[PDB]
Amino acid sequence: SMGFKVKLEKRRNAINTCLCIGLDPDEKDIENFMKNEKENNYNNIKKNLKEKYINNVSIKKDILLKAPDNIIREEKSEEFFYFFNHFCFYIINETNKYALTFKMNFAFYIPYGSVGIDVLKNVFDYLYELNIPTILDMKINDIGNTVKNYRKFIFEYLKSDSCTVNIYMGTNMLKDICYDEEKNKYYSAFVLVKTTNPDSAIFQKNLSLDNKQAYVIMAQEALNMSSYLNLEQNNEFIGFVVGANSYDEMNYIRTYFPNCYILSPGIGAQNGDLHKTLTNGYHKSYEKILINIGRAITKNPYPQKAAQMYYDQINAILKQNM
Amino acid sequence: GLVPRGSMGFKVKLEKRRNAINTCLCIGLDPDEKDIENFMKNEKENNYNNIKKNLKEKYINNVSIKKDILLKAPDNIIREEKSEEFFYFFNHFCFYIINETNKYALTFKMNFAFYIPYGSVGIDVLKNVFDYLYELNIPTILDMKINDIGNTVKNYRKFIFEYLKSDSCTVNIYMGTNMLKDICYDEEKNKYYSAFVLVKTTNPDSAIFQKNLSLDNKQAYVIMAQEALNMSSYLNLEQNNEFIGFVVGANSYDEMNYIRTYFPNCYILSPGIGAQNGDLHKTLTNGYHKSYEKILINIGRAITKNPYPQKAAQMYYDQINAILKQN
Numbered sequence: 029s030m031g032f033k034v035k036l037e038k039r040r041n042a043i044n045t046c047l048c049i050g051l052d053p054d055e056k057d058i059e060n061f062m063k064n065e066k067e068n069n070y071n072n073i074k075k076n077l078k079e080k081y082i083n084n085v086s087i088k089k090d091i092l093l094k095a096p097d098n099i100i101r102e103e104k105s106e107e108f109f110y111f112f113n114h115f116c117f118y119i120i121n122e123t124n125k126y127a128l129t130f131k132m133n134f135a136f137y138i139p140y141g142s143v144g145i146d147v148l149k150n151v152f153d154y155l156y157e158l159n160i161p162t163i164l165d166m167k168i169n170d171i172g173n174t175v176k177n178y179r180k181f182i183f184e185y186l187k188s189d190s191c192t193v194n195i196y197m198g199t200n201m202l203k204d205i206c207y208d209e210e211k212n213k214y215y216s217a218f219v220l221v222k223t224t225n226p227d228s229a230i231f232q233k234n235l236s237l238d239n240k241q242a243y244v245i246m247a248q249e250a251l252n253m254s255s256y257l258n259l260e261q262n263n264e265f266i267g268f269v270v271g272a273n274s275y276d277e278m279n280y281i282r283t284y285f286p287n288c289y290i291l292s293p294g295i296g297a298q299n300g301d302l303h304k305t306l307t308n309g310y311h312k313s314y315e316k317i318l319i320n321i322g323r324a325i326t327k328n329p330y331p332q333k334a335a336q337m338y339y340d341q342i343n344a345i346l347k348q349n350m
Numbered sequence: 351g352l353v354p355r356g357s358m359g360f361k362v363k364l365e366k367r368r369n370a371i372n373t374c375l376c377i378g379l380d381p382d383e384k385d386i387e388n389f390m391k392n393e394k395e396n397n398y399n400n401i402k403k404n405l406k407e408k409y410i411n412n413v414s415i416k417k418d419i420l421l422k423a424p425d426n427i428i429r430e431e432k433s434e435e436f437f438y439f440f441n442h443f444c445f446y447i448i449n450e451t452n453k454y455a456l457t458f459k460m461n462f463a464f465y466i467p468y469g470s471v472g473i474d475v476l477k478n479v480f481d482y483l484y485e486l487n488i489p490t491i492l493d494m495k496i497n498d499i500g501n502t503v504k505n506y507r508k509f510i511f512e513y514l515k516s517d518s519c520t521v522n523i524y525m526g527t528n529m530l531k532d533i534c535y536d537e538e539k540n541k542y543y544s545a546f547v548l549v550k551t552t553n554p555d556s557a558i559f560q561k562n563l564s565l566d567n568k569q570a571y572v573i574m575a576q577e578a579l580n581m582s583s584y585l586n587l588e589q590n591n592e593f594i595g596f597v598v599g600a601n602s603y604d605e606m607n608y609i610r611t612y613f614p615n616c617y618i619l620s621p622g623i624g625a626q627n628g629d630l631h632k633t634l635t636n637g638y639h640k641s642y643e644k645i646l647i648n649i650g651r652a653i654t655k656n657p658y659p660q661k662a663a664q665m666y667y668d669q670i671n672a673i674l675k676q677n
């Protein structure tokens with residue numbers, strides 16, 4: 029209804045940040061949450077159980093509402109589901125007031141089989157209830173007929189607001205990701221432009237087309253496709269993933285494509301410089317420079333305060349730039 | 351000299367299967383919602399002939415997920431297990447295709463995108479499909495086109511190679527070749543795995559980055575192929591009976607010729623025959639290798655959307671083999 033372009037602008041007005049919280053729980057994170065909860069009489073799960081929108085998740089809600097010691101003795105095959113889902117709800121409850129958007133990387137939800145996809149669905153349901161803008165980081169890429177399935181999963185099933193896409197196969201895939209002709213629906217995506225891999229220069233900088241590096245060619249071809257599709261008219265957009273640690277490229281992209289949307293991972297665990305990234309990617313509509321922080325929040329034992337720190341420092345930097 | 355199924359590298363598993371059935375047919379198993387519905391409707395109209403045949407097969411008892419449901423009589427599913435009906439018919443469609451066609455398949459390739467759009471249920475199907483293929487000992491490829499930073503991609507490695515026990519997967523290395531160290535190698539367990547990296551794809555606008563981008567006088571697709579092989583060499587994959595190969599579209603005749611000419615011993619996986627109308631004779635001619643597990647020809651919809659998939663697969667098997675003979 030709203031369109032992601034409008035959802036972001038409105039939430040930005042309400043919470044006055046561009047922090048994007050990454051929710052990428054790994055096996056150790058889930059184990060540690062279980063062990064800690066078992067040792068603290070399930071303080072955090074008990075807190076989760078008092079929040080209203082837990083009552084609106086789709087999958088195995090009555091399992092999620094059971095007391096933890098009853099899960100362990102009466103529903104032991106659901107133990108992992110229960111603690112994984114409660115870890116996610118805990119992180120969301122503790123940090124959401126500081127988040128312009130949450131980004132969930134699909135890779136963390138698949139490696140146990142179906143169980144993590146139920147968790148992923150419940151996480152998207154929960155964020156949708158909270159009216160928090162979402163990004164599914166799935167880096168999808170395929171031919172047209174195949175990628176329609178990701179469109180269905182991401183935008184119909186999860187009802188995500190956006191996703192990440194790798195357009196190296198071609199730009200035309202976006203016609204079957206960001207647009208549903210039969211339903212007249214439009215969706216937003218961030219395409220990979222400059223990544224945080226230590227060897228990202230191999231293909232992104234060292235390849236070129238008539239004196240422009242590959243990353244610029246890719247960004248321009250993504251914007252060309254957004255144009256073709258008329259996304260921005262329908263309150264949607266195609267934006268760019270530009271690594272936090274990639275200051276020169278961030279500076280170039282923001283200069284050359286003044287009003288583009290950028291999603292920037294790489295601060296915290298991958299050591300990117302927050303002040304430099306945010307300053308080089310700055311826009312007064314700062315929803316156009318999403319600063320993603322995953323592990324520096326989710327692997328912090330004090331995640332509310334971790335998220336608050338990033339929120340407060342982003343605030344101070346936004347003020348300096350304004 | 352003998353080893354049980356599961357206890358040999360993919361290079362050797364492919365060679366042995368090629369020596370057994372003498373083809374390079376890769377059957378693609380990409381069931382869409384229409385396929386599942388049509389299977390359910392056809393089985394309901396014919397008293398579930400194909401499902402009953404699936405239920406006769408020894409190895410259906412060895413799959414991991416919801417065997418209790420899978421082994422039920424089909425009329426008991428429809429009447430008593432309404433919430434499991436889609437799982438049951440989806441999984442049985444996949445078993446039916448595998449049962450009908452496996453005798454002609456050098457490998458099966460499952461594209462992940464078709465198994466995710468209903469949420470978790472298709473992932474249970476996918477796991478059972480891989481467990482079933484593992485028991486049949488037929489070489490597998492998970493077409494997932496994975497790409498991320500090292501720390502994240504480890505999770506795909508676990509899903510693909512531990513959970514599904516796939517032989518191989520597809521990878522997009524645009525983000526950086528070093529991701530392969532965390533896909534084709536597990537440093538904790540000291541295990542090696544195989545992959546096909548995207549080199550030249552079948553989408554109509556594939557040239558826009560793969561050919562237009564260049565370094566000096568080499569196009570992106572050539573540079574990416576070389577980088578991938580340099581990594582294979584670094585990781586010692588072929589020593590350990592694994593490999594990094596290349597996805598080169600059936601419709602990409604010049605690039606196929608370039609790749610086979612400049613990398614004479616590479617493994618190529620080539621989709622685009624059938625539904626996408628690639629030229630089979632040209633593809634096989636240009637990509638030919640006397641070890642023809644090095645030129646896998648993937649055919650999905652032209653088999654799986656045919657009402658007689660056993661015969662469609664046989665026809666493609668025979669057609670491929672006739673072209674191989676005239677090479």
Ligand SMILES: Nc1c(F)c(=O)[nH]c(=O)n1[C@@H]1O[C@H](COP(=O)(O)O)[C@@H](O)[C@H]1O
Pocket residue numbers: 050052133165192220222223224225269271293294295296297298320321322323324498499502
């Ligand atoms: N999608 C990404 C890129 F394109 C990229 O160039 N670099 C990335 O880190 N990510 C993802 O961004 C997140 C980084 O998380 P954190 O380091 O824990 O703060 C992970 O989900 C990464 O997979």
Ligand SMILES: Nc1c(F)c(=O)[nH]c(=O)n1[C@@H]1O[C@H](COP(=O)(O)O)[C@@H](O)[C@H]1O
Pocket residue numbers: 170171174378380461493520548550551552553597599621622623624625626648649650651652
């Ligand atoms: N992985 C692929 C590529 F890199 C590519 O360049 N072209 C492709 O078609 N596929 C996949 O190959 C299969 C083509 O299937 P069929 O057309 O029904 O015979 C599908 O799974 C496609 O997603």
